[PDB]
């Protein structure tokens, strides 16, 4: 939301069987954020390895 709040908050696809071929999908944008996370969790430290 500090980067792309409109893309983060609004999902790109609204129909299960009809998804527009968006260049920057909300899930696609969130994929980079998931791949770019590193912090400390309850059980230890959480990071992203291999982007997946």
């Amino acid at each position: 939301t500090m980067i792309q709040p409109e893309l983060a908050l609004i999902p790109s696809t609204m129909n299960c069987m009809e998804v527009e071929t968006t260049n920057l999908t909300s899930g696609q944008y969130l994929s980079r954020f998931l791949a770019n996370t590193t912090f400390r969790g309850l059980s230890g430290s959480i990071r992203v390895k291999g982007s997946t």
């Binding site: 009809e18 998804v19 071929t21």
Partner: protein, 50 residues
Amino acid sequence: KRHGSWKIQLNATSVTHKPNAIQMALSVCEDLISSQVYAILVSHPPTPND
């Protein structure tokens, strides 16, 4: 015609570039996967850079 194998047959199916990622993947799954096809040739889509 140029291969001497008698137990091997070659078939070609036309898979057009569907103008949607969902349409392309769904068309591939419904046609190529259901055809038990082996190998696929990749070609550029209508967009010059995509």
